[PDB]
């Protein structure tokens, strides 16, 4: 499947197809781990991965996660379609950093978008307002234990 | 206990503090809260809901029902779809219908634990639904049936003989045990007529 | 037709024992690798012991 | 306390045991001669026979 | 692989010879699929037989 797609459905950095180096090596390793974790429907998953019919809701159903989680991952990574495994792995790592912190993907996006510049010396001061800070803290803390 | 209308939409920006409190109390994410609202049928326009103690009690009852049976919200939705009480809202559960649902759920969970079957697998093997498109196994069945057998002998009149002829191909495409078991599965599927 | 019949038949015959031989050697190979991996696992286990 | 350390490293020894047994299982499933090949075998042989 | 290619050519020319001998041009039983490339092109022998 990878060779038939010609690394187009795999994605590449600054090169056509893919150069034999550490970036493509790590990408292939993570892709193989994802294929191993696919499960029983992994055969059909790769089947429409050969095509361009692998939809976000189908991926959500196969992985067993939440469709709203997948959608907020889409809107956070900025990709409207799983054109390449670069986009796929970006979405997967966003989901991973959301799940590890037990917090919503848009909350992760808000945390990343914090330009902590505090009156210039860099791009701009993206510091949220007071109530925005309070709401963000509530959202990121809402998923903890009792003790 | 204020009665104000708040939205439980996971995609809703600026989530209500009461919504977050309900999320933390139920211990389920926003998507599972939306699924619980869908199951309860108390959903409104823009996935809103009035903050009323009756609806809160209904949601907490659903959560306790899932917890006592050791099942998640999605699995609860699947078993509700497979249950005879499917297509009904939790509000539309009478004082005698709720205990019936409880006892049915308990017996189903006990038998499922005894049989040692997972949740999505039992969903697939209990519902008559489909995956959504043609599977690679179906494509292989087509590619091994069109060449091997043509209409010449397939256009016979004996349905049982046609089933016998098609049985080895069905066994090959389903990784089955024996051609006769493939034939008997064909007999089930023909007496059922899914499509 | 008949002459072609028998020598296609026997060419198929050599093809079939070729297939059986390759299957048997593949089984022997994968047995070899599984035993080698078992020995390796045993040796690090002996190290920890 | 050195006994405790020995017990903990026994735990990691048996954990590595589980790790390489899982590796054995996955490589056995990744072997060449496998269930798909043998199902091909059985189906084709049954029909053609 | 080379021997299977030769045997397939032999069976195709035998089929053509049978077609000429029976003065018919519609009968076909060698319909490909003998070389199942997914499995190194095996189980061609019983199909050709």
PDB file of N, CA and C in Angstrom, chain A residues 44 58 66 68 72 132 139 142, chain B residues 10-11 14-15 24 31 131 136:
ATOM      1  N   UNK A  44      -9.812  -3.882   6.450  1.00  0.00           N
ATOM      2  CA  UNK A  44     -10.651  -2.947   5.711  1.00  0.00           C
ATOM      3  C   UNK A  44     -10.156  -1.515   5.862  1.00  0.00           C
ATOM      4  N   UNK A  58     -15.574   7.220  10.202  1.00  0.00           N
ATOM      5  CA  UNK A  58     -15.171   5.821  10.104  1.00  0.00           C
ATOM      6  C   UNK A  58     -13.929   5.549  10.943  1.00  0.00           C
ATOM      7  N   UNK A  66     -14.234   9.163  20.521  1.00  0.00           N
ATOM      8  CA  UNK A  66     -15.405  10.007  20.342  1.00  0.00           C
ATOM      9  C   UNK A  66     -15.304  10.807  19.048  1.00  0.00           C
ATOM     10  N   UNK A  68     -16.677  13.633  18.411  1.00  0.00           N
ATOM     11  CA  UNK A  68     -16.371  15.025  18.721  1.00  0.00           C
ATOM     12  C   UNK A  68     -14.894  15.210  19.039  1.00  0.00           C
ATOM     13  N   UNK A  72     -12.673  17.838  16.900  1.00  0.00           N
ATOM     14  CA  UNK A  72     -11.855  18.890  17.487  1.00  0.00           C
ATOM     15  C   UNK A  72     -10.381  18.667  17.162  1.00  0.00           C
ATOM     16  N   UNK A 132     -11.680  34.200  30.469  1.00  0.00           N
ATOM     17  CA  UNK A 132     -11.196  33.143  29.586  1.00  0.00           C
ATOM     18  C   UNK A 132     -10.205  32.242  30.307  1.00  0.00           C
ATOM     19  N   UNK A 139     -12.069  23.934  32.372  1.00  0.00           N
ATOM     20  CA  UNK A 139     -12.140  22.878  31.368  1.00  0.00           C
ATOM     21  C   UNK A 139     -10.977  21.903  31.497  1.00  0.00           C
ATOM     22  N   UNK A 142     -11.422  19.793  34.821  1.00  0.00           N
ATOM     23  CA  UNK A 142     -12.666  19.066  35.054  1.00  0.00           C
ATOM     24  C   UNK A 142     -12.504  17.549  35.036  1.00  0.00           C
TER      25      UNK A 142
ATOM     26  N   UNK B  10     -20.922  18.910  23.012  1.00  0.00           N
ATOM     27  CA  UNK B  10     -19.458  18.899  23.180  1.00  0.00           C
ATOM     28  C   UNK B  10     -18.748  19.918  22.307  1.00  0.00           C
ATOM     29  N   UNK B  11     -19.271  20.185  21.110  1.00  0.00           N
ATOM     30  CA  UNK B  11     -18.667  21.172  20.225  1.00  0.00           C
ATOM     31  C   UNK B  11     -18.985  22.602  20.636  1.00  0.00           C
ATOM     32  N   UNK B  14     -17.391  27.781  25.107  1.00  0.00           N
ATOM     33  CA  UNK B  14     -17.808  28.384  26.373  1.00  0.00           C
ATOM     34  C   UNK B  14     -18.812  27.484  27.095  1.00  0.00           C
ATOM     35  N   UNK B  15     -18.339  26.292  27.456  1.00  0.00           N
ATOM     36  CA  UNK B  15     -19.184  25.325  28.142  1.00  0.00           C
ATOM     37  C   UNK B  15     -19.622  25.866  29.497  1.00  0.00           C
ATOM     38  N   UNK B  24     -18.198  16.258  35.511  1.00  0.00           N
ATOM     39  CA  UNK B  24     -17.338  15.709  36.554  1.00  0.00           C
ATOM     40  C   UNK B  24     -18.106  14.760  37.466  1.00  0.00           C
ATOM     41  N   UNK B  31     -18.692  13.880  25.020  1.00  0.00           N
ATOM     42  CA  UNK B  31     -19.309  13.032  24.013  1.00  0.00           C
ATOM     43  C   UNK B  31     -20.224  11.986  24.622  1.00  0.00           C
ATOM     44  N   UNK B 131     -21.274  -3.506   7.647  1.00  0.00           N
ATOM     45  CA  UNK B 131     -20.133  -2.639   7.914  1.00  0.00           C
ATOM     46  C   UNK B 131     -20.279  -1.277   7.247  1.00  0.00           C
ATOM     47  N   UNK B 136     -13.085  -6.608   1.842  1.00  0.00           N
ATOM     48  CA  UNK B 136     -12.122  -7.374   1.034  1.00  0.00           C
ATOM     49  C   UNK B 136     -12.483  -8.843   0.916  1.00  0.00           C
TER      50      UNK B 136
END
